[PDB]
Subunit: 321 residues, 2 copies
């Protein structure tokens, strides 16, 4: 229902511009900031998803004009289907989606008059709910009431898909309101909060490319590798060697296809010449045999215990001596 | 003899990496820094032109490995035709040349044991001379003698193509030596100097993408627009109006197809809303009728005289009243 192969790009030079001009084809979509003069006239900044028609490099002002029709924008402007021109300059950002191209997160985009619910898969992006609230507000309960309607609307999706983390995002304050609600009905899940200028498919592609996703992913991996280490310690001191550490030991273990899961600290992957390539390969081999690889960052409450043991231990399937 | 449609890219994020991985095809060429262990083993940094085979994104070390054969490198290593892997990381630069894609400058790439001569056209890059000097050195005159052999070798090409500027580039000191010579035989041309790590086709693609080209281009435009302004002043005060300035005046002039050449200061093209688009269009119209457009930067000894007159004057073909 929504592609996942998108690329964010920061226009740093005039060549970044020619590149975009050369590879952006007919029916490709682009996500970027822009201005629209709706109404009399009122110039209002906004972020839209545009399906390209054709691009134009402007020699004199040194910028790229992407021509096309608006695929998505805040519904309150009713501008979908319209033609628009995106003026891309040095300094701007843009997410491109060409046609020819372990933590499950539940995403809720909430604006004060619209909202969207979706879940990202390695496959793609499925959009559960996505509707307006525009005709639903005229004094009374409004905000609190609307937030609740979304929180409820979310709780079903969570229980129904049991995601690892919940991402609450969107333009100012309202999202904090919805957080308050959804939180008031479970306290069983981790809720994250970040802000994007709108609650549309544009804000969605924007959120996925924001730093918050990494944070959610890294908290997950840090957590799984913490319990695993416990599984390692209690197992270590009680089997015994159904656990091993040290580079060489882990290689002979790979040889036998014994590695159930391997724990490796981030350092063993940062500038290590013929080693960073070697370890790198070891790690692909482990997965090429249904092995689990959990990288370990400085901040995990298990990083030091691990580093102590050379920085790489493998929980074994069977003894290797 | 050499493509001109190349794009320089600064790897700033992991997406810059996926992008490269997605658009780099089979027989495309890439120019980048790298290391080669030639010989026993000796790891030596170098810049080569690689014809791609296939790329690989490395999930764990987060980098792209471009696989292929070496199209060009310093001849002293005799490594052309070899297979090599380029390890591209966040922080690196790369110039891509895909297969599916007013100042004439003479370029001389000189290294202490090799050199290259070429001229860039809007059409492409023609490579005049390009040979080794390797077997030509064992005590005696050597440097001075070799420099002279290149200077001579260049003088013919210059007189034969009468280029606007001469670009002397390459790795340390030797280029300064050749400058001294070539200069000692003409003092009739503008010689520029910049440095690249090698004197190959790689160093060439590198030079073309370096700041020096802009400098050469801008000095040219500043010079042509200075004499033109003189042509404007003496013409202004003596025709009379075969010269006009001011935005509106220039538009009605375009209407008649009277603009021979237009002079416009850089400011009229920097953030001017519905104007920067308007002027921009005016300028394309002038060229869409064999008109000459000379942009004017702050530093030209004619910038202020121009700005005085609204910042835009047109030398006319005939009166427009």
């Amino acid at each position: 229902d929504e592609k996942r192969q998108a690329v964010k790009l920061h226009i740093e030079s005039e060549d970044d511009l020619w590149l975009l001009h050369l590879i952006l084809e007919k029916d490709d979509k682009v996500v970027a900031k822009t201005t629209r003069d709706v109404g009399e006239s009122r110039r209002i900044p906004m972020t839209i998803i545009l399906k390209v028609d054709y691009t134009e490099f402007q020699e004199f002002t040194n910028r790229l004009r992407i021509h096309g029709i608006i695929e998505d924008a805040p519904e309150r402007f009713g501008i979908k289907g319209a033609h628009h021109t995106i003026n891309l300059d040095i300094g701007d950002e843009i997410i491109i989606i060409k046609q020819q191209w372990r933590s499950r997160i539940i995403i809720a985009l909430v604006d004060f008059d619209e909202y969207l619910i979706a879940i990202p898969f390695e496959q793609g992006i499925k959009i559960l709910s996505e509707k307006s609230l525009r005709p639903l507000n005229e004094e009374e309960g409004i905000i609190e009431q609307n937030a609740l309607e979304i929180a409820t609307e979310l709780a079903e999706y969570v229980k129904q898909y049991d995601p690892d983390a919940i991402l609450l995002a969107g333009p100012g304050f309202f999202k904090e309101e919805v957080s308050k609600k959804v939180n008031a009905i479970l306290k069983n899940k981790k809720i994250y909060i970040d802000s994007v200028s709108s609650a549309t498919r544009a804000g969605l592609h924007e959120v996925l490319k924001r730093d918050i996703i990494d944070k959610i992913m890294t908290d997950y991996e840090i957590a799984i590798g913490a319990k695993k280490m416990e599984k390692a310690m209690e197992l270590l001191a009680k089997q015994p060697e159904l656990v091993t550490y040290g580079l060489e030991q882990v290689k002979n273990a790979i040889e036998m296809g014994a590695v159930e899961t391997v724990l490796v600290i981030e350092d063993l992957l940062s500038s290590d010449e013929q080693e960073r390539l070697t370890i790198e390969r070891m790690l692909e081999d482990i997965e090429n045999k249904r092995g689990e690889v959990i990288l370990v960052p400085k901040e995990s409450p298990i990083y030091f215990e691990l580093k102590n043991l050379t920085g790489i231990l493998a929980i074994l399937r069977f003894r290797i001596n």
